[PDB]
Symmetry: D3
Subunit: 254 residues, 6 copies
């Protein structure tokens, strides 16, 4: 397991403020697209080979990687001599495959698209281009191993927009408790699982996932820590804010 | 206890699509402002005396009640004789006090504004102009009674945008469980509680509420049923959809 | 035949610039809602009894008629004595029934709604709240009479956004010619036709109309003259422009 | 001199944020339309008779005055008995004439419209529905008297978005100085001046005013104090802010 | 005749939803800018030399062609070695000249701009960057030949937003008939025609075209088939829809 | 003195119409970003070395310089041979350093960022990426020299949205007069001045500048001529208009 599949084909409707100009994962935190953070999460854990399921506004990502250095460092232009000098040429020990998974495909359909990429894989990683966390991807991987089932997902606690501490009908305090976790993406999967995807129209979180669960083939890796998606403006700002203040839990690297 | 205090002073930022023209509670479900539904929830339970904390775009509510019949029935105009004939003149055994609680006041500040209205009250009811439920307001009231503490709130389950069934690290199914409830408004309160509100700038959900909890003065009425707020467009549509289909749980009346 | 049924329940999507605040027919030309013009077209022809199928933003119309005089004349307020003095109290020998035909109903469904209003009618008139013309409604009526069939529609020439004069493959000039007319609304109808409407979901221009045609029950009254709808901004402006310049063909009255 | 003519027919383009729903002068400060403040400025000085040149979105003003009390006080509805009880019925010793000065008229054209209203007047007052000040309207009036010329305007200092203190090429400090005033509206005028307005298309600030100046018929009343217009959002907020903080210089009354 | 001149300088006002970020012809169908489709229509017919009259947002097109391969295929980045590997490098046997025809120029003015490009041409092709069709460009060309006149245009049937079948005042059915065609662009022209263009301000569809017609120099090539422009959102969606479903008549190639 | 520091990190709030897609200085006049004009102003005066304080949407500038030639000339693509041929390869004898001065930094903070760039400088130039003028930068430079103080700023006359000619209370005419100038940017400065900037949060126009003035270290270079910023749409259009008409005072070059 060394490859990570990342969804980046959505419309970003709930974040049009930005998405009208680019694909929601191309949206930044700390001047860096969220996708990059996520990929930084992987790398930190050994995953340096990615596949990106592009769709709505893909060229944006294409261009991103196509001019990464620029995107990444200061620069000087010696125009008189038509010369470009990037101050910092930082290298990423990555491999990036950008795939047009279709304009109208769903999560399943898209994933199903990039099979060949991970077919012979012992296993591969799959997640959303909208969530960051201080997740221990490795750990997840070994867990998916330990258990041997086709799929592993990361269960997380959600962010709450009025969670309580109630004991004996008495509110003890204003703070999820126990059977209160959700699917935060970060899947560990079996190529074999693609068989579940019927077509482009497939919403991975429907049959595929449901069936797997029903199939006793669905495991949940519990993450108590930091996890946060970005679906709205407030989502951004918050993350933006965390980052400014040197408080980006998800920031597991140098 | 016979009076209900309803907040209607917010900006409705997350629903500007509608709020640019009116106050978020003036937004409708089934052609009726959500406030009306809520008031319909009360009435159904015996509360026919209300106080409305107006603020952002208050005149809208003013006008609403000022021309209710019209708002409510078909009508014929015999213009030649400058005559207006409302088909249906439906009467509400209500009493409505619309109060300008200030343009910049918070939840606490606003409530604090309308004290005089409920000062001599054994107790009064307080909620948000954004949530509907099949709530048994009466029951809550007797519970607040039974317990005698200054405040009662309704604990509810939230609506989830990926809740799981996990047993022994195995995802059993995709569905809150136990210590998974939230504050859904619908408060039963002690006039005495206003003492907690410092000023217009008070966010009721801060000191007042927190202190009450900390004070061992905060009770929680558990509601397992139907509860839904409206903060966004999707929120509306859903509620709109429920309503069309003759599926408005909150609809506890004729 | 003395009653006119006018649709006013649409969303006005293509004219949101205005429709976000009111129902598209409440949009004005010469400071007067387009509906009014249309009703002015009828009156001019003897129709002074109307039924309005309200839906999206109906209260706007309600209010319109409810405060017509105001809407229509200058005014003085002697506030010190809380007195309102409308300069001009112009009377319309009309009768206006405003009916909530539902938020989600279609053209058929809506019409079907207001049956009772025109059931015993020899015949009634039906049109859209979006089109004006120098139409000779009377003439249409007698024609619908002459022919005796259940329905009459007004065939018109459309407005063109690059119509040519081509003879022997040669463009003679830049100017519809012959089998080039459209349905411009302005229907003359048989109560009996409602039987064709299946439900609220009915789009009158589908089965009802089609079936009538197919049924050899559909007649077309040909209008060569002035006809113009308002679906967009440009539509408005144009009409606005026509009006300024004392050039509103549709203006068939004093 | 006892009548004041106030322009309220503009499009409010630079404040669409609000103007899409109402005429810019109907925009509020302290929950009160700016027009009201202005009229409050007059009253404070003895002017209790006004004429309002309506145009873009006039009905809004119509309605405003038509339901002033409501607009102005809290209220209770005894719906069961279809009764409305306004807490505070505050009376204004005013007289208000709302005049449709046309949708497309300019400043001159509009004013020219309401002649009859001030023809026999010794003199009348004329200003914009966008500016507030601690202006001493009386003083202006006596000045216009003292001088006897046809027109008086109020010269004011503008609000600056980087004004300096420069002496001998040295910036002494960051703060208008001397021949640095502008026209802030608040005109004192001679009915006779209308003769200058050619038509609806007249922009008062063009021939009329220019000619008057050129004619040696234009006087300037100098106001050093507080003066502020509202053309943008920031304009509002500022004024809003001033008001909150009990800092509304223009507030010359009880 | 081997060169095609394509207009791409408009503002795209009626499609701002997209045009705010790019020039309307850069808008896509099937992930490909509409311009590309059009050019694909030409190529299919032998035209592989184009001139593009850029204006509003030209750089977008510049960039498009500048990174076509990328725009066109999947890709892999071996960042560690700063390497870019486009999966598919598809070659177009084209030649593309992108010309800034000015920000404010009209159709005539723009065309007039690119004379030199087609001066010595026997003849050249000229059309809009907004329309697709299953047009037989060749055929048109030979027709323009056959006839020898300076200009040929393609006459087409328009798309109708309520076209009827009326015989003897009876609506036979709901479906243009005969002298019902329009100018759908796709012009075949004589360099000589540029002489008609007076300046940048020229709207080709005014004097130039009119004069040609009047001059007995204007021929019309009749196209009964598929023709569709894109001026609005709905226009897109439709085309988008056609394309999905493997139904893009205009798609005359591999 | 040979280096110019130009701010380009703002949000461009008052010009979102354009700024939603790019940084306000990337906005064009005559198809060229305003920054370019400004840099053209410098060059004209001998300044061909620049530093750009990027922030909000910096990549836009990066890309601008990265593909300048393209941005600047017509071009031909010989796609069949994947060849790009820029018609005009115009060289600028410049040097351009693009620096990410931070997303949230202020004017001071940003400048403070690029110290190293001008530390050993006798002196350097500093201005805004929003203003053009027919300024004699050289002259300013020699003046800053002549005087020897740490800072020089350009005092200018502002553009007025109703400036008068008042003598003896009489308005002579409608036209700033004397102690009526403002800070128009175009600073000449002493590296030493950076010591005044406390951090990224510094608004240069606060302590730094104020202190300098207070310090008797602030000189003002008086510019009577043409000066114009671009903060709004109207600002653009005007400048756009000036440019069309061959009337761009600021245009001091070939
Ligand atoms: N058809 C779809 C739907 C989603 N995604 C991806 O799945 C992730 C999560 O989607 P989510 O943010 O919840 O929805 P969006 O499509 O991104 O936008 P919206 O706010 O409209 O739901 C994102 O990386 C999105 O790009 C995708 O590639 N294809
Ligand atoms: N200062 C405030 C804040 C809120 N409310 C009321 O409190 C309820 C819940 O507020 P909520 O919907 O969560 O926030 P809003 O202010 O309504 O709008 P936004 O989306 O911007 O949060 C609503 O009845 C709102 O009118 C209020 O009267 N005054
Ligand atoms: N469900 C519907 C659809 C239309 N209409 C009415 O039918 C007429 C013509 O509709 P049209 O203007 O073509 O569509 P709209 O609904 O008005 O708006 P849109 O631009 O989104 O098509 C209008 O009087 C509209 O109010 C209606 O009452 N109910
Ligand atoms: N044709 C016009 C123009 C202006 N006014 C009035 O003149 C005043 C000042 O106009 P101003 O605010 O400067 O312009 P607006 O028309 O209001 O809007 P915009 O921002 O588009 O300039 C306002 O009371 C406006 O209502 C008017 O009645 N008729
Ligand atoms: N001054 C103009 C006008 C139009 N066109 C081009 O002519 C074609 C047809 O124009 P049309 O779509 O009808 O108008 P647009 O300018 O594109 O936009 P709008 O909706 O505002 O009319 C398009 O390729 C447009 O780019 C152009 O180059 N220059
Ligand atoms: N934090 C800031 C503020 C301003 N600037 C730059 O300072 C100049 C002048 O700023 P101004 O136009 O007045 O404000 P903006 O930030 O550009 O936008 P807004 O309209 O929101 O004020 C511009 O070159 C802007 O890019 C900057 O780099 N950083
Ligand atoms: Mg989604
Ligand atoms: Mg998401
Ligand atoms: Mg809130
Ligand atoms: Mg809420
Ligand atoms: Mg419709
Ligand atoms: Mg229509
Ligand atoms: Mg104006
Ligand atoms: Mg103004
Ligand atoms: Mg056009
Ligand atoms: Mg077009
Ligand atoms: Mg700024
Ligand atoms: Mg500025
Ligand atoms: Ni270098
Ligand atoms: Ni009656
Ligand atoms: Ni009177
Ligand atoms: Ni009472
Ligand atoms: Ni490779
Ligand atoms: Ni070449």
């Amino acid at each position: 397991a060394s490859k990570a599949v990342i969804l980046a084909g959505g419309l970003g409707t709930r974040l049009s403020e930005e998405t009208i100009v680019k694909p929601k994962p191309m949206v930044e935190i700390g001047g860096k697209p969220i996708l990059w953070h996520i990929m930084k999460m992987y790398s930190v854990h050994g995953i340096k080979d990615f596949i990106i399921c592009c769709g709505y506004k893909g060229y944006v990502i294409k261009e991103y990687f196509a001019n990464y250095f620029l995107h990444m460092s200061d620069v000087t232009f010696h125009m008189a001599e038509n010369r470009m000098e990037v101050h910092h040429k930082r290298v990423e020990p990555w491999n990036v495959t950008l795939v047009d998974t279709g304009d109208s495909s769903m999560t399943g359909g898209r994933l199903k698209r990039v099979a060949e990429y991970v077919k012979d894989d012992e296993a591969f990683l799959f997640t959303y281009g909208d969530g960051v966390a201080d997740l221990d991807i490795k750990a997840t991987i070994d867990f998916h191993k330990a258990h041997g089932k086709k799929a592993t997902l990361t269960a997380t606690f959600p962010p709450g927009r009025g969670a309580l501490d109630i004991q004996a009908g008495q509110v003890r305090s204003f703070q999820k408790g126990d059977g209160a976790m959700i699917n935060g993406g970060f899947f560990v999967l079996n190529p074999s699982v693609i068989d579940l995807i019927d077509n482009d129209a497939t919403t991975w979180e429907q049959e595929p996932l449901m069936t797997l669960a029903q199939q006793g083939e669905l495991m949940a890796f519990e993450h108590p820590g930091f996890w946060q998606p970005m679906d709205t403006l407030r989502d951004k700002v918050y993350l933006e804010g965390l980052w400014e203040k040197g408080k980006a839990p998800w920031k597991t690297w140098e």
